[PDB]
Design a protein around this ligand. Structure first.
Ligand code: MG
Ligand code: NA
Lengths: 149, 271, 77
RNA sequence: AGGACCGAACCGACUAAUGUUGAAAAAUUAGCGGAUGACUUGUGGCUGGGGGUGAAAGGCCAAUCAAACCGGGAGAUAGCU
RNA sequence: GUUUAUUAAAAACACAGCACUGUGCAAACACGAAAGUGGACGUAUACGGUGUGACGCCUGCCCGGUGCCGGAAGGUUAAUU
RNA sequence: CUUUAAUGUUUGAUGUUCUAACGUUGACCCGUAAUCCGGGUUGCGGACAGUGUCUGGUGGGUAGUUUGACUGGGGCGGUCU
């Protein structure tokens, strides 16, 4: 499936390129998010005019964390914080993601999400990561300098 | 206790009854009762889908609380009661807030004893809390296989589960059958062995005793004609074939599990 | 029923032909899958029971054109 | 207390005689088994024919059952009478 | 106790007991193009299948064949290419 | 042109991780004074499972059939050019 990239993707291209992406990836990830759009001739003929707004305004305001899946883990952000927690094992606490941050205030601004709500878990025997999470148990349990720092 | 009835008649010759005096010889608690009607083994097409079911004594269903989701409120066990719908006795228990519920009866539980649910619960029988919070190597019952559903493992008369190992999000359980299974550590489970363990020692003693429980007679496949069963006819007593079901599948060894969705949670099939 | 809402593919009757050319009637079923398509014109997920060929048709045409055809045909989605 | 015992109602059907164009398309008389239980019975409901149901006799499914009845393919076919 | 309503009631069926075997729960299995339903609002002291058939003494030897089960160096082997 | 090192790079493979397809007969909210269904939030699985087409094996579970004639009856034996 040929698609033109509206934003930067990891290993496909950057800011406009007819990339041959697998149909499942395009259908389920790139187009449902604001990453790409298929090139059915007319679409690129509109893209060649849209590039003035896209490559400058949208590019400046948001060019990373297109789906907050891999950019959060790669481009470390929101490391500085003040809330500690209980003993070093985050569980159900959103904490702080916006306030007390400097890098995430200029142009491109990646973001994070919440964690598993309290129904079986508590402040011992495990931990959570301050980042986007779909899995909450098998997900990576790397320290984020927020659980105890 | 087990009592051998004297042989005053053939039918009382062999019966052995499980008599427990601490049970409640009164009516059940009315709010926690619901009608349940017998089915005769018939599904909604009206066809016998399970044979050998039909009749028996009328029974009222007890709403037994398997979720145990009221945390932090202690409860005192008012009474132990006979449940017609299961092999285990149940316990009517009163919470400090005034609500009454039914639970399965652990091995040692008796009237006046206290129980509790949740993370901050003492490790004594009857208490219910996550395997996460239960120490490894312990005996447990009424066990959830995913969080919040309600326990459905080690429920029958004297069964229990042995928590063998803890590894990450999953706890490993030895089930009563000998199978080794992973289960999420967020799953609740109740401490102790569920009681009435002498339930095995009862012998019905007569055909009517099995008829009272809803079990209709089993007719051997060899006793039938070829149009009815694969074991079929023959002049006199004849088998001359491998044992099979009425639908032709080979009993006596052939394995029937085919899931491929829950195999990842099975560590070691039963020996 | 096993009908693709994009293409209208139904089950179709044919023959199982043996090596002795014994013809026993059979059905060819389509490759139906219930899929949630992200429609941008309404910012929504629309569920449709669509074959794989219908999914290729959606990928080519655009979900807007396919839904326009569906609502011109009826086909409450 | 009992799928305990004797025995009416009630449920059945072991023997004999009768009857066999019967009083009756399965009964009568005399005896006979169970008779608080796996009992029996009324009212309503459910299971449908390659199907049901069957403490299993190929038993029963409207006097019909190794595949019900009705209508149709149909004037099947009949090297036979 | 049940059984060939209407020539067979029995040594036949069933049965309490026992053994094997399958089944970890969305269980196995069954009725169902499916949805769903029974199993079961049960959870291996449970449920299905199969065989034997109270109870007492027991239940010897054989895995060569068929079946099932498990494991594998290797051989042959379909669609596709 | 003989040969031979590497990667952006195209599909082959093993493995591990991941989530966004897809599952949930987990929990909570709403349609809604509703164990259905749907939407939503969250967790757990996760490109596995499962379904469509094609394909090898198995398959009396089911179906349609075939299983000769001569013959001092028929069968068994014999025979048949
Ligand atoms: Mg049974
Ligand atoms: Na036989």
């Amino acid at each position: 499936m040929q698609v033109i990239l509206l934003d930067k993707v990891a290993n496909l291209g950057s800011l406009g390129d007819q990339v041959n992406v697998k149909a499942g990836y395009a259908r389920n990830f790139l187009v449902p998010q604001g990453k790409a759009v298929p090139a059915t001739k007319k679409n690129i003929e509109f893209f060649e005019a849209r590039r003035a707004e896209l490559e400058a305004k949208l590019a400046e305001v948001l060019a990373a964390a297109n789906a907050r899946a891999e950019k959060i883990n790669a481009l470390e952000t929101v490391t500085i914080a003040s809330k500690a927690g209980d003993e070093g094992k985050l569980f159900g606490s959103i904490g702080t993601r916006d306030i007390a941050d400097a890098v995430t205030a200029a142009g491109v601004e990646v973001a994070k999400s919440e964690v598993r709500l309290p129904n079986g878990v508590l402040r011992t025997t495990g931990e959570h990561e301050v980042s986007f999470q779909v899995h909450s148990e098998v997900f990576a349990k790397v320290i984020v300098n927020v659980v105890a720092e | 206790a087990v009592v051998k009835c004297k042989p005053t008649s053939p039918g009382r010759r062999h019966v052995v009854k499980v008599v427990n005096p601490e049970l409640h010889k009164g009516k059940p608690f009315a709010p926690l009762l619901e009608k349940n009607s017998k089915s005769g083994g018939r599904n909604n097409n009206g066809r016998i889908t399970t044979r050998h079911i039909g009749g028996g004594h009328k029974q009222a269903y007890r709403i037994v609380d398997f979720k145990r989701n009221k945390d932090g409120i202690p409860a005192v066990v008012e009474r132990l009661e006979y449940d017609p719908n299961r092999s285990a006795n149940i316990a009517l228990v009163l919470y400090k807030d005034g609500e009454r519920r039914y639970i399965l009866a652990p091995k040692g539980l008796k009237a006046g004893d206290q129980i509790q649910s949740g993370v901050d619960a003492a490790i004594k029988p009857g208490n219910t809390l996550p395997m996460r919070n239960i120490p490894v190597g312990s005996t447990v019952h009424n066990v959830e296989m995913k969080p919040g559903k309600g326990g459905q493992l080690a429920r029958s008369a004297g069964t229990y589960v042995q928590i063998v190992a803890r590894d990450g999000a999953y706890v490993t359980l030895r089930l009563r059958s000998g199978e080794m299974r992973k289960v999420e550590a967020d799953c609740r489970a109740t401490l102790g062995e569920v009681g009435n363990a002498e339930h095995m020692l009862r012998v019905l003693g007569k055909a009517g005793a099995a008829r009272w429980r809803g079990v209709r007679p089993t007719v051997r496949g060899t006793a039938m004609n070829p149009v009815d069963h694969p074991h079929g006819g023959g002049e006199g007593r004849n088998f001359g074939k491998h044992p099979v079901t009425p639908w032709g599948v080979q009993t006596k060894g052939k394995k029937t599990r085919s899931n491929k969705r829950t195999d990842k949670f099975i560590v070691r099939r039963r020996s | 029923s096993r009908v693709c809402q994009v293409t209208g593919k139904r089950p179709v009757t044919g023959n199982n032909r043996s090596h002795a050319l014994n013809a026993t009637k059979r059905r060819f079923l389509p490759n139906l899958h219930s899929h949630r398509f992200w429609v941008e014109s309404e910012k929504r997920f629309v569920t449709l029971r669509v074959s794989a060929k219908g999914m290729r048709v959606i990928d080519k045409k655009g979900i807007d054109t396919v839904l326009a055809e569906l609502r011109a045909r009826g086909e409450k989605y």
